[PDB]
Amino acid sequence: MESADLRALAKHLYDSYIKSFPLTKAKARAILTGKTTDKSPFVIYDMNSLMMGEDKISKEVAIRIFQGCQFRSVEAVQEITEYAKSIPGFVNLDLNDQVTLLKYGVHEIIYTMLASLMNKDGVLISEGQGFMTREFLKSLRKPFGDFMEPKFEFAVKFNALELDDSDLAIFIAVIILSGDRPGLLNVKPIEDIQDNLLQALELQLKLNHPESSQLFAKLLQKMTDLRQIVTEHVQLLQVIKKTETDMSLHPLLQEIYK
Amino acid sequence: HMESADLRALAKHLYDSYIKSFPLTKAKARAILTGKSPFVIYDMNSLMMGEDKIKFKHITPEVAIRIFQGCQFRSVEAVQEITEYAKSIPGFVNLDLNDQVTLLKYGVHEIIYTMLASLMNKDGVLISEGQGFMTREFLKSLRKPFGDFMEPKFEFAVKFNALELDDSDLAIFIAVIILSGDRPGLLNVKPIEDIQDNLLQALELQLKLNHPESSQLFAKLLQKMTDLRQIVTEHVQLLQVIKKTETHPLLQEIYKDL
Numbered sequence: 001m002e003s004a005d006l007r008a009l010a011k012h013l014y015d016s017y018i019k020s021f022p023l024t025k026a027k028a029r030a031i032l033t034g035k036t037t038d039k040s041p042f043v044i045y046d047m048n049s050l051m052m053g054e055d056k057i058s059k060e061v062a063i064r065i066f067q068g069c070q071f072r073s074v075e076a077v078q079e080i081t082e083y084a085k086s087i088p089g090f091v092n093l094d095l096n097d098q099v100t101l102l103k104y105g106v107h108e109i110i111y112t113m114l115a116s117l118m119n120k121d122g123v124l125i126s127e128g129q130g131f132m133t134r135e136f137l138k139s140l141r142k143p144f145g146d147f148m149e150p151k152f153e154f155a156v157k158f159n160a161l162e163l164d165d166s167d168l169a170i171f172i173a174v175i176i177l178s179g180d181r182p183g184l185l186n187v188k189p190i191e192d193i194q195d196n197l198l199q200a201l202e203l204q205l206k207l208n209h210p211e212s213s214q215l216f217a218k219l220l221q222k223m224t225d226l227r228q229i230v231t232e233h234v235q236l237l238q239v240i241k242k243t244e245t246d247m248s249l250h251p252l253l254q255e256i257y258k
Numbered sequence: 259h260m261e262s263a264d265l266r267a268l269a270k271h272l273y274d275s276y277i278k279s280f281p282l283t284k285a286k287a288r289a290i291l292t293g294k295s296p297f298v299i300y301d302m303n304s305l306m307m308g309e310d311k312i313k314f315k316h317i318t319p320e321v322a323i324r325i326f327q328g329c330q331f332r333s334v335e336a337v338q339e340i341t342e343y344a345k346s347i348p349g350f351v352n353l354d355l356n357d358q359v360t361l362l363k364y365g366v367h368e369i370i371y372t373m374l375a376s377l378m379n380k381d382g383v384l385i386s387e388g389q390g391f392m393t394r395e396f397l398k399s400l401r402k403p404f405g406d407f408m409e410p411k412f413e414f415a416v417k418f419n420a421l422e423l424d425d426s427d428l429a430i431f432i433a434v435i436i437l438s439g440d441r442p443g444l445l446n447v448k449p450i451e452d453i454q455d456n457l458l459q460a461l462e463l464q465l466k467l468n469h470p471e472s473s474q475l476f477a478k479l480l481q482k483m484t485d486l487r488q489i490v491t492e493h494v495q496l497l498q499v500i501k502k503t504e505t506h507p508l509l510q511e512i513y514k515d516l
């Protein structure tokens with residue numbers, strides 16, 4: 001509740017976010033905004049360039065691309081699980097509650113952090129070596145095209161907040177420590193932690209974006225949506241299953257969705 | 259540094275930070291073990307009551323596994339506690355971020371063993387911040403490999419405790435283990451060994467003032483840092499073997515580091 005303590009928490013979480021996630025928003029923007037020879041991505045925009053991209057950087061194309069998403073998603077869950085452990089107080093919660101918070105939190109965090117890798121035209125892939133265009137994804141067959149586009153619609157809205165990684169490190173932690181996840185055993189100690197994180201987020205946003213009116217409230221409002229867009233995801237994912245048994249759902253994802 | 263006053267200041271800095279990072283000090287633990295009051299777990303029936311009496315945070319929906327999971331739960335807590343303490347080691351946070359992660363990754367296991375000895379005597383171990391005490395013989399008697407898994411910890415602890423180190427000794431010792439320049443994958447060994455050189459100087463002087471009658475205690479303690487490498491090696495092996503013969507994916511991911 002003391003400023004120096006809230007700033008200390010901001011640095012701790014930012015430091016841990018750098019250690020846990022391979023590809024930051026700062027690196028992503030450097031790649032997307034060019035300026036560079038060395039950091040420049042190969043662009044996948046159609047079938048032919050996809051085949052060349054796998055050479056530079058079988059199953060049906062939309063399925064292959066889907067598996068590429070789930071593979072990274074599984075990695076994100078692992079990365080996020082590792083980040084959570086660094087949130088002061090998280091590993092001291094009831095073990096069942098830790099599982100519960102991760103279970104309902106990872107998807108919201110994945111969307112949030114997927115936005116870092118996106119602009120209105122596409123998404124970084126392969127740790128930023130590749131870039132796949134929105135239009136190519138949107139044009140995939142049967143339901144897979146409509147499956148990719150909502151991610152971009154969110155990202156375009158979220159990125160207009162212009163958060164940097166030090167903002168996102170705290171925002172993500174706030175998302176994890178939500179006392180309103182179904183099935184939680186001890187809501188109060190989770191809310192105690194979130195209160196501290198909310199305080200830290202509030203002070204971080206004012207110092208880092210002093211000219212951004214009510215960014216805190218606007219950022220919390222975005223924590224609103226994620227909840228509904230995650231529902232659409234699992235919904236579309238369910239229907240995909242009921243029509244695509246040519247699909248590998250990783251056990252970690254498998255159990256998250258049960 | 260190199261002046262006596264500098265080493266004493268460094269010793270005091272590490273002691274104060276050690277006191278803040280760890281819930282149960284050796285001094286408090288020793289008062290409890292020497293009866294100078296905890297619930298005692300000595301068989302199956304008293305185990306069932308102790309999880310009712312003591313609010314265990316790892317009880318997740320067979321006895322020996324349950325106890326194993328409790329060891330893992332507390333260790334994950336210790337990792338975070340050790341991670342915060344490291345930040346107070348002068349120079350640590352200024353090291354290359356990958357090197358900090360590497361040092362912690364290979365150091366936490368040796369430190370957990372070391373500090374577990376603080377909670378142990380020849381007859382059992384304090385648990386749950388000292389509210390409980392589980393007997394050696396009960397742990398030693400667990401089925402399949404779990405019994406052989408617990409007893410080496412006691413065999414180490416009894417040997418280590420004969421050095422009769424106190425908390426101000428241990429605070430520096432723990433720092434020395436963390437700042438080990440021979441961890442695989444380190445990028446910049448020179449500043450790590452520079453700091454470890456300072457910590458070693460301070461440990462040597464601390465042991466001389468705090469144990470003036472203890473012949474070559476410094477050398478004897480460094481020899482014990484020897485062991486820790488190999489006993490941690492045997493530990494991770496048996497930890498692996500448990501997987502190949504025993505045992506949620508999210509829970510698996512929380513504990514993957516161990």
Ligand SMILES: O=C(O)c1ccc(-c2nn(C(=O)c3c(Cl)cccc3C(F)(F)F)c3ccc(Cl)cc23)c(OCc2ccc(Cl)c(Cl)c2)c1
Nearest residue numbers: 065068069070072073076110111113114123125132148151
């Ligand atoms: O790195 C990262 O943080 C990260 C994070 C997320 C994605 C990514 N996941 N995803 C999903 O549906 C998804 C999501 Cl959100 C959450 C859980 C499960 C799934 C799954 F299981 F159902 F998929 C996407 C749908 C469309 C798009 Cl554009 C991206 C995603 C991601 O994708 C990278 C990627 C790799 C390879 C190819 Cl080929 C492509 Cl196109 C994208 C990366």
Ligand SMILES: O=C(O)c1ccc(-c2nn(C(=O)c3c(Cl)cccc3C(F)(F)F)c3ccc(Cl)cc23)c(OCc2ccc(Cl)c(Cl)c2)c1
Nearest residue numbers: 325328329330332333367370371373374383385408411516
């Ligand atoms: O407080 C503390 O500083 C502290 C610190 C350590 C233990 C404790 N860890 N542990 C391990 O194997 C172990 C170790 Cl050394 C190092 C790294 C990873 C592991 C893991 F990951 F593989 F486990 C043990 C094996 C046997 C015993 Cl006796 C204890 C340990 C510890 O155990 C407390 C405890 C034990 C049993 C129950 Cl039921 C409960 Cl509730 C608590 C406490």
